[PDB]
Design an enzyme around this catalytic site. Structure first.
Site, PDB file in Angstrom:
ATOM      1  N   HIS A  54     -31.328 -11.707  30.429  1.00  0.00           N
ATOM      2  CA  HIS A  54     -30.771 -12.137  28.950  1.00  0.00           C
ATOM      3  C   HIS A  54     -32.064 -12.222  28.041  1.00  0.00           C
ATOM      4  CE1 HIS A  54     -27.674 -14.378  31.324  1.00  0.00           C
ATOM      5  NE2 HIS A  54     -27.116 -13.449  30.574  1.00  0.00           N
ATOM      6  N   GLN A  57     -19.399  -1.177  30.219  1.00  0.00           N
ATOM      7  CA  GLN A  57     -19.518  -2.045  28.950  1.00  0.00           C
ATOM      8  C   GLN A  57     -20.366  -1.405  27.875  1.00  0.00           C
ATOM      9  OE1 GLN A  57     -18.917  -6.657  28.817  1.00  0.00           O
ATOM     10  NE2 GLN A  57     -21.229  -6.178  28.864  1.00  0.00           N
ATOM     11  N   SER A 113     -25.987 -14.222  36.654  1.00  0.00           N
ATOM     12  CA  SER A 113     -25.702 -15.601  36.583  1.00  0.00           C
ATOM     13  C   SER A 113     -24.869 -15.611  37.964  1.00  0.00           C
ATOM     14  CB  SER A 113     -25.068 -16.082  35.523  1.00  0.00           C
ATOM     15  OG  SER A 113     -25.764 -16.105  34.240  1.00  0.00           O
TER      16      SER A 113
HETATM   17  N1  AMP Z   1     -30.222  -8.202  35.184  1.00  0.00           N
HETATM   18  C1  AMP Z   1     -29.989  -7.920  33.878  1.00  0.00           C
HETATM   19  N2  AMP Z   1     -30.744  -6.828  33.293  1.00  0.00           N
HETATM   20  C2  AMP Z   1     -30.517  -6.515  32.013  1.00  0.00           C
HETATM   21  N3  AMP Z   1     -29.627  -6.949  31.413  1.00  0.00           N
HETATM   22  C3  AMP Z   1     -28.671  -8.030  31.695  1.00  0.00           C
HETATM   23  C4  AMP Z   1     -28.950  -8.395  33.021  1.00  0.00           C
HETATM   24  N4  AMP Z   1     -27.838  -9.144  33.302  1.00  0.00           N
HETATM   25  C5  AMP Z   1     -27.062  -9.108  32.286  1.00  0.00           C
HETATM   26  N5  AMP Z   1     -27.414  -8.502  31.448  1.00  0.00           N
HETATM   27  C6  AMP Z   1     -27.007  -8.166  30.147  1.00  0.00           C
HETATM   28  O1  AMP Z   1     -26.883  -9.556  29.507  1.00  0.00           O
HETATM   29  C7  AMP Z   1     -25.739  -9.583  28.494  1.00  0.00           C
HETATM   30  C8  AMP Z   1     -24.724 -10.783  28.902  1.00  0.00           C
HETATM   31  O2  AMP Z   1     -24.335 -10.664  30.260  1.00  0.00           O
HETATM   32  P1  AMP Z   1     -23.646 -11.914  30.826  1.00  0.00           P
HETATM   33  O3  AMP Z   1     -24.304 -13.048  30.554  1.00  0.00           O
HETATM   34  O4  AMP Z   1     -23.320 -11.660  32.497  1.00  0.00           O
HETATM   35  O5  AMP Z   1     -22.217 -11.830  29.919  1.00  0.00           O
HETATM   36  C9  AMP Z   1     -25.134  -8.198  28.846  1.00  0.00           C
HETATM   37  O6  AMP Z   1     -25.434  -7.085  27.683  1.00  0.00           O
HETATM   38  C10 AMP Z   1     -25.373  -7.883  30.196  1.00  0.00           C
HETATM   39  O7  AMP Z   1     -25.527  -6.374  30.413  1.00  0.00           O
HETATM   40  C1  PAU Z   2     -20.637  -8.936  26.237  1.00  0.00           C
HETATM   41  C2  PAU Z   2     -19.915 -10.176  26.860  1.00  0.00           C
HETATM   42  C3  PAU Z   2     -20.749 -11.502  26.706  1.00  0.00           C
HETATM   43  C4  PAU Z   2     -18.862 -10.520  25.770  1.00  0.00           C
HETATM   44  O1  PAU Z   2     -18.118 -11.483  26.322  1.00  0.00           O
HETATM   45  C5  PAU Z   2     -19.420  -9.896  28.323  1.00  0.00           C
HETATM   46  O2  PAU Z   2     -18.473  -8.943  27.998  1.00  0.00           O
HETATM   47  C6  PAU Z   2     -20.434  -9.674  29.227  1.00  0.00           C
HETATM   48  O3  PAU Z   2     -21.350  -9.255  29.155  1.00  0.00           O
HETATM   49  N1  PAU Z   2     -19.808  -9.850  30.518  1.00  0.00           N
HETATM   50  C7  PAU Z   2     -20.223  -8.846  31.481  1.00  0.00           C
HETATM   51  C8  PAU Z   2     -19.958  -9.242  33.044  1.00  0.00           C
HETATM   52  C9  PAU Z   2     -18.452  -9.793  33.390  1.00  0.00           C
HETATM   53  O4  PAU Z   2     -17.840 -10.039  32.546  1.00  0.00           O
HETATM   54  O5  PAU Z   2     -18.030  -9.436  34.316  1.00  0.00           O
END
Ligand code: AMP
Ligand code: PAU
Ligand code: AMP
Ligand code: PAU
Lengths: 283, 283
Positions: A38, A153, A186
């Site tokens: 992030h 995504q 996460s």
């Molecule tokens: N290891 C990673 N490297 C780069 N971007 C990430 C990583 N993990 C999550 N993201 C990006 O962070 C944003 C939020 O991720 P999330 O918190 O899992 O919803 C999304 O655009 C993800 O693709």
């Molecule tokens: C872009 C957001 C934060 C929008 O809620 C979300 O779709 C995201 O990044 N989650 C990806 C991983 C998951 O939802 O399994």
């Protein structure tokens, strides 16, 4: 000074004020419990005058068989990390601000989302498109920073943005990894000692596949077999999918020409992890 | 001077320039072949610094059993009327500007649209919500002016706006009528001499019903029967529906309390006409 905002009305006013001074806005949507992945997005967003991070575990994009209830949450941790990394506003709406009692509208699409994780997770991308439409309307960003780690995504959101004429750009950023190769997530917090050791096979399969591709291998069936062999050595791993697809359409590729997205999803114990590599502009 | 614009890119630039001078924007979406009904919306829109009229016969909101091919079209007429009535931009995109080859995204909802015309016209409101999301994103209006004549549409759009956090207002404007009561509509051009004479029963049924309601009649079954009796005297009329519903939810009302939307749809020959009355704030 950084503003921690929980109100939609309040977020709109802050954004409106920034616009009145012609300030550009970089936006990083997340589900919280922040890590270096992030933070790499935030760093890119700092090219803009103001940076917004949203933290919202969006219930619309989880099914009952998934991990909404156990999803890691630690606002104190997240706020501190945003504070320490130059974030201007952290937007943390609760679900009652986002989805009022009579909420019934949605955004969805008829291509792209039916492949890969979308096929495995009914309703997921409707949840993603719907919540981002709302965030985009509330926060009015100029550039939205998203990770290649969720490759499909990125492509889905880019398509929604084009189709619905959102006046903004989606900027895709590289996958950030732990020291031993594991893609940061996460959800990595779920892994036991043995599970984390096993999970390294996922990134290893990605590293091998990308190496094979960049060395001229065009037969996807062969690349996939080489990836499968690595993954099948770990008894804790149950493959969800391994697919080599066109990065624009998500459709399966038998023979590689100009591009390839090689994507893996797998369960390590109960935890569902994903990883990919992306190669473009091949001759 | 008025700009006639066919390019999305060009419309966006014009709107962006207006915003940079902090000018408010009033927007009137239409399907062209303009009449005094549309002009009454323009007049309201003139409260804003700049007024935009869009003219687009949106293919998404017509089914094959409807009148997309015969829908009246006369751009010369429309441009002149906008010019003469103080419109600042007429946005006339063609379908290839709006819906590119790979277009597959949509906006829809799970309440409201399943009643009245929505039940009779599968896919119609998806077409409406989807195209207005696009126009709203392109034109960035402050207030959008819509006619009470399409009552359900007003409620649908208002709900979409609330649910998706569009930073704009929907202002509903009264039904404009011909000298003899017929609600103005571009589709009135379809009516033969005999059909137009018959069609007056629609507005007559609306006038009677509103009079009965304002005189204290609460039994909707009785009001509907009185409306049916008027309409059934015209052999050229085939009723599609007659319904008295709650204006917020579109659900049928047996006994009137605080509000009522009385809506009629009927075929006069082949032409499908609609009309309504709306009463609010009853004790
Ligand atoms: N290891 C990673 N490297 C780069 N971007 C990430 C990583 N993990 C999550 N993201 C990006 O962070 C944003 C939020 O991720 P999330 O918190 O899992 O919803 C999304 O655009 C993800 O693709
Ligand atoms: C872009 C957001 C934060 C929008 O809620 C979300 O779709 C995201 O990044 N989650 C990806 C991983 C998951 O939802 O399994
Ligand atoms: N007779 C009328 N009185 C008031 N508004 C109208 C009338 N006819 C159409 N409108 C509105 O004009 C807009 C465009 O209508 P249409 O051109 O039929 O797509 C919509 O908001 C309609 O509800
Ligand atoms: C608001 C617009 C112009 C959007 O296309 C349209 O939905 C509309 O007003 N038409 C209403 C009449 C009809 O389509 O049958």
């Amino acid at each position: 000074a950084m503003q921690v905002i929980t109100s939609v009305k309040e977020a709109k006013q802050i954004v409106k004020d920034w616009k009145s001074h012609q300030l550009s806005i970089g936006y990083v949507p997340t589900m919280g419990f922040l890590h270096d992945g992030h933070l790499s997005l935030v760093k890119h967003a700092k090219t803009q005058d103001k940076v917004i991070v949203s933290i919202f575990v969006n219930p619309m994009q989880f099914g009952p068989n998934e991990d909404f209830s156990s999803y890691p949450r630690d606002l104190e941790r997240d706020i501190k990390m945003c504070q320490d990394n130059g974030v201007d506003m952290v937007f943390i709406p609760d679900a009652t601000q986002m989805y009022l009692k009579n909420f019934s509208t949605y955004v969805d699409m008829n291509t792209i989302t039916d492949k890969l994780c979308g096929a495995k997770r009914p309703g997921h991308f409707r949840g993603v498109c719907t919540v981002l439409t709302k965030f985009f309307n509330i926060l009015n960003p100029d550039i939205v920073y998203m990770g290649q780690k969720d490759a499909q995504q990125c492509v889905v959101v880019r398509h929604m943005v084009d189709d619905l004429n959102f006046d903004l750009k989606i900027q895709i950023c590289p996958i950030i990894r732990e020291e031993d190769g594991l893609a940061k997530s996460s959800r990595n917090v779920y892994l036991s000692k043995e599970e984390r050791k096993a999970s390294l096979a996922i990134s290893q399969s990605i590293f091998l596949a990308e190496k094979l591709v960049r060395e001229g291998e065009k037969n996807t069936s062969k690349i996939i077999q080489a990836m499968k062999d690595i993954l099948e050595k770990e008894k804790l791993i149950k493959i969800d999918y391994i697919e080599l697809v066109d990065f624009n359409t998500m459709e399966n590729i038998e023979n590689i020409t100009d591009n390839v997205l090689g994507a893996v999803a797998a369960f390590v114990g109960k935890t569902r992890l994903i990883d990919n590599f992306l190669v473009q502009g091949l001759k």
